[PDB]
Nucleic acid binder design. Structure first.
Lengths: 313, 314, 314, 313
DNA sequence: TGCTCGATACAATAGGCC
DNA sequence: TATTGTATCGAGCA
DNA sequence: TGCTCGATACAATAGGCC
DNA sequence: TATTGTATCGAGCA
C-alpha cells in the first residue's frame, strides 16, 4: 500500500553515493520540499548530445527537472566518472565510454527539454567548502523553482499525481485514454503493453506484436543498444532510431520486410529498472519508417509522442 | 572559515549506515530542525548498565537527547550489533562483548539522565515498512521535544550556543572560568588541557601532570580501558574509576604513593575522535581517592562535575 | 621468466615484522644453511592449540610437518599481543590471548597433531642474558640435520614431491595426480579452482557449495570454520570433528531434515586468509561424513577420509 | 661474557632495513661465511669523494672490504636515500645533504683504500638477467674474495683477531704498544683514551689533554662536523682537518695559540656508536700543524697513522 | 494430457579493484 | 562485475 | 647527552563497491 | 578508498 512508497523513497535515498555532497543536498531538497505527490529519481542516467552517458543527482520526471551537485573533479567516490563541460542544459558529470558499454541495458533517458539546476558546494575549489548558509540558499531557491513548476503544470491541468499502485497497471492508461511520452510511462512486462492495445495475454515472448486495431502499426520491444543479434541505436533527441543486424546478410534480407511491412511502430524499449535490476519497458513514442539503407540499415523517425490505447476485444 | 561546520555536518551524516532506515530518519530530523546552534553526533557510542557497549543514531550533547531508529531484528547484514532489551532510557541495540573489547579506545559516554526517543519504522514486523506519514509524525514530535528542551535551557540561561572555532581552543575555557560535563568538553591533545590550568606547555608526552595552582590535585590523562602497562575501568554512570596495573609489584609500590597523595585528580580520558580517528581528551570530572588494594586496587570516586580554570603561570 | 615468484616469496617470508628479538637470526640462518628450496617453508605460522587459543610457530616446513620455535622466556618482546605459557611438548610456548584470538579467526590456522616441534633456547639463564653463538649454531645444525633426515625418509618412500610455485595452486596439477591429499598440504586460490578439480568447467563460483558431479553422495563445501553473522562453525584442534550451526534457530529447524536425508559426505575446503597479502584461499581439510544432528549443538561432521579423487572436466 | 658477541651480531643484522634485498643478501653472506673471528658492520656510514654522506650494507673493518646490494631507484624503505654513480670503489647509495646534516654526529669513515663488492640483484655487466641462483653465485664469489683477503693478511701476519671484551679496554692497548688505524680503534670515553697515554683519570670532561710523555703533542677530542661553538671538517681521504670557529674574534685570538702552541695533535674524534648512538671516540691519527689564516682557518695534515701508547705514571 | 527440456528472468555473491 | 543456480512458462515430443 | 613516549607521517591492509 | 599498523621526530626531564 503506502509501504511501497516508503520503501521506494528509502531506496532512492540509500544508493551508494557518487559524490561527497550528494547525499546531503538531495536529502535536504526532498525533506524540505516535503511533497510526495512528486515522483523523484536519484542517479538518473541520461544521454548527452555527444552520445556519452551521463547522470544527474536528483530527477523529477513529472516536471522534467534535474538537480546536480557540482564538486568539481577532486572528491569522487567513483573514480569511474569524469568532469567536463557540455551543453547548458546538460550535466557536468559523465561516465567513461568503457563502462558506458556495460551500462547499455540501464534506463537512459533524453534531457533535451529538461532543465538542470546546479548546487555549488565549493568556494574557490580546490579545498575549502562553502558555508552552509549559501548551500541552503541555493537549495531553497531550487525548491521554490520546483514548486512553481508543479503549480504551473496543475494550472495547465497537465499534472497527474503519482500513485505507486496504479502506475504500472495497464487499466489506468486504458482509462486515461492515451499512453504519453510526457507521463513517463514504463510497464513491467511485454504482456502488459500488449494488453493496453487490446490483447489479452497470460504472458508474451516475442520481440514484436501486431497492433490489433491498426494493420499498418506494429508494437515493438527492441533493445535500443547493441546486442548479439541486433545493432540498434537511438539519438539523444529521441527522434531517430536506427535498426541494423550484426550479420549484414540478415540486414539485406530485412530490407524487403521493412519496406513492404507495417510503416509505423509503437516503441517500448527494454530497460533495466533503476532499482531492482529488472526488465521494464518504457514508451519511446510512435515512429514511422523512413528509409532502409544497406549500410546504415533501417531508420525510423518519431511522428508522435502519444498513442491512443484500447480495451481488449 | 565556516567550512569546518560544513565538513563536520557532511561527515556526521555521511557515516556508513548501521541500520537501514537510519540515514532517512536522522537526515530528516536534522534538516527539518535545521538549528545549528545545536551540536549533534551520529552513531554515538554509549555505555549501558551492564558493561555492554551500545550506540545511538543521533545525539544532542547540549540537551542530553538521543534518537534511536527501531527496526530491531534485521539489522541489515552484516552488522556486529545485536537487538536486546535494557533499561527504559537505554538503547535497544548493542554490540557483542567480543567486539566491545575491540572498541575500548572509542569515545564512550554515560547516558545517565539522558532521554532516548525512538522511531518505529515497521507497522507489521517482521517485514512490512510503515507509511511515511506516520514516520514523519514521529519525527515531528521529536523535533518539538528538541525545540522545547532547547527553550527550557535558554530561558534558564544555561544554554551555550555551539561554535566550531572556539570549542577546541583552551583560551575560551580559561575565559569561561570553568570546565563542566554539561559543556561536554573534549580537547585535541594533552598540551591544551594542560594549558587550561596555567601551563605554557609546547608538548606533553607524560601521563600525569602536576597541577600548578593546587598541590592536592593532579591532572590525569588515563586510558580508562585495559592496555599494555595497566588496567583501568569506569562505572557506566561515570561515578567510580578503578586503577590497577599488569604487574602486581608496581601496584604494590604505587599503593603507598596513592595513599600519601595527591588525594584528588581532575580527569581527562583519552578517547578516539568520533570523526577522523585521532586521539582526543575528554573531561570526565573531578575525582577523589577512596581506597588502596590489590586487584581493583586504587578507586577514585567523582566528587565534582565542574573544575575552575587558570591563566598561564610565569 | 616467473622464477621471480620464488624470490618474492622467500624475501616476504623472511621479511615479516618480527615477533621476537632473536627470531630473524635463527630462521634466516636455518634457511640459508639448509639451502634446499625444494622445501617450502612458512614463517609465523598460526597453529590450533588443544586449549583452543591460537598459537604461532616461527618456522614451518609443511612437506615435512616440522616446526621450529625460538625460546626466549617471557619478557623479551615489547608491545605485542603474544603471551608466554606452558602446554603440550609438541605445542608452542607462545600464544595469543583469547580476546585477540577471536579477532584473528579468519587467518589460516592449522592442526599440529602429528607435527614435531624443535626449540632453540637462546638464553643461558633468565634476565635476558644471551647464550654464546656456539651452542646456538649447534642447535641450528642438529635441527637442519634432522630436517634433511626427514626429507630423505620421505624421498625413499616416494612420498616427497618437490615444491613449485607455478604448479601448486593450479587445479590441473591435482587432476593429473590425480588425488588431493592432506599430506600435500593443498590450498587453492578460489572456489572455482576447487570445483574444477572435481569435474566442473566453472568460470567463477560465488555459491557456498556445489554437488560432486561424479559422486551423488558427496558435496563440495567451502565453510568458514569460525563464527560469522550467518553461521556458527567450529573445527576440532585435531581436525577430526567439524560442527555446524546457524545463528538463528528458525534457520536451524529448516536445516535438520535437509541434512539427515541430504548428501552424507562432504569434501571440505575451508576459507582462510592468505598468510601473505590477505586474500581468500581454500584449504583442503578432508572428506567428512555426517555423524550427527543434535539441534542445540547443530550438525556433527566427523572425518573419515584424508584423501579425495579429482576428475577431468565433464 | 661471550654473550656480547651474540647480542652484537643480532643487533647488526636486526636494523631497520633500507633496501628490499638487504636482509637476505647480508644474512646469507654472514651465515654462509660463518667466520665470527671477523668483525662486521651493517649500514656503515662513509664519506664519498665529494662531501656527500653515503652508506654501505655490510662492512669488514679488518679487511677494509665493503659489500653493497644494487636494487636501483625504487624499492626504497627510506625516501631520503638517493641513487647515483660515483668513484671506482664507492657506494651507489647516498643521503640527501640536509638529511645528512642531522647525521653529522654519526661515525663516518674514509673508504679510500677500501674495496667494494656489489651484489647485482637484477642484472650484471655483460648484461645477463638473474634471480635466485645467480644472486647466490655472486654471494659465493664474494665470500671467497673475503676469505682470500683474510688469508692474504694472515700470511703477512698483519691480521689481528676480533675480541669484543678487550677491544674497548685501554689495558690491551697499553699492552700491545701501538694504537693504529689498521686496528680500527674506538673507545667508550675520554678518560679511557687518556688513560692509554699514562693518565690515571677517573673522569675527564675537557676538549683536550696535554700529553704526559711528550710536551709537543696534544691529545684532542674534536667534533669533526660543525656545531654551535666550532666549524670543523675532515677530508674524505682523512688526510686534512680544518678548524675554524663560529665567531671570527675567537678564530683570530686562537691563531697565535695555534702558531705558538704544541704543533702536533693526537686526534680521537667524537662519533656516535652505530648501535645505541652513545658518544664514542674513534682514532683518526697523529696530525701535525701545517698552516693557519683567518679566511679559511687552521689546517692540520696527518703525519702518521700509528701512535705509541704508555703505562700510567 | 503428462513428461523432458530449453530459454528467459531473477536473486545471490566471491573475486578483484579502488 | 561477471557468473551460476533456482524457479517459471512455454515449446517440443511421446 | 641519554632516555621516554605522544603526536605525527606513511606504508600495509581492511572495507566498500561493481 | 578508508582505517590500522609501524617507524620516525622531537619536547620535556633527569
Amino acid at each position: 500500500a503506502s509501504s511501497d512508497l516508503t520503501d521506494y523513497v528509502i531506496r532512492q535515498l540509500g544508493r551508494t553515493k557518487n559524490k561527497r555532497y550528494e547525499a546531503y543536498v538531495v536529502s535536504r531538497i526532498i525533506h524540505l520540499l516535503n511533497d510526495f505527490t512528486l515522483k523523484f529519481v536519484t542517479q538518473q542516467f541520461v544521454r548527452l548530445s555527444n552520445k556519452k552517458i551521463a547522470l544527474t543527482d536528483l530527477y523529477f520526471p513529472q516536471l522534467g527537472i534535474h538537480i546536480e551537485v557540482d564538486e568539481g573533479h577532486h572528491f569522487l567516490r567513483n573514480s569511474k566518472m569524469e568532469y567536463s563541460l557540455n551543453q547548458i542544459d546538460e550535466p557536468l558529470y559523465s561516465i567513461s565510454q568503457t563502462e558506458s558499454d556495460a551500462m547499455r541495458e540501464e534506463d537512459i533517458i533524453s534531457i533535451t527539454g529538461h532543465k538542470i539546476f546546479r548546487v555549488n558546494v565549493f568556494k574557490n575549489q580546490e579545498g575549502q567548502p562553502q558555508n552552509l548558509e549559501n548551500i541552503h540558499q541555493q537549495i531553497d531557491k531550487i525548491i521554490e523553482e520546483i514548486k512553481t513548476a508543479k503549480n504551473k503544470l496543475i494550472e495547465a491541468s497537465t499534472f497527474k499525481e503519482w500513485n505507486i499502485e496504479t502506475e504500472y497497471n495497464p487499466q489506468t492508461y486504458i482509462d486515461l485514454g492515451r499512453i504519453s511520452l510526457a507521463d513517463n510511462v514504463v510497464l513491467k512486462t511485454t504482456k502488459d503493453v500488449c494488453n493496453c492495445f487490446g490483447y489479452s495475454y497470460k504472458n508474451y515472448q516475442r520481440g514484436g506484436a501486431l497492433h490489433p486495431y491498426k494493420k499498418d502499426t506494429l508494437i515493438w520491444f527492441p533493445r535500443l543498444y547493441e546486442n548479439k543479434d541486433w545493432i540498434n541505436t537511438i539519438s539523444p533527441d529521441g527522434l531517430t532510431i536506427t535498426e541494423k543486424s550484426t550479420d549484414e546478410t540478415i540486414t539485406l534480407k530485412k530490407l524487403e520486410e521493412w519496406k513492404n511491412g507495417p510503416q509505423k511502430r509503437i516503441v517500448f524499449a527494454r530497460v533495466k529498472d533503476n532499482l531492482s535490476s529488472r526488465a521494464m519497458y518504457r514508451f519511446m513514442g510512435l515512429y514511422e519508417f523512413q528509409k532502409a539503407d544497406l549500410k546504415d540499415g533501417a531508420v525510423w523517425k518519431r511522428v508522435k509522442s502519444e498513442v491512443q490505447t484500447y480495451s481488449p476485444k
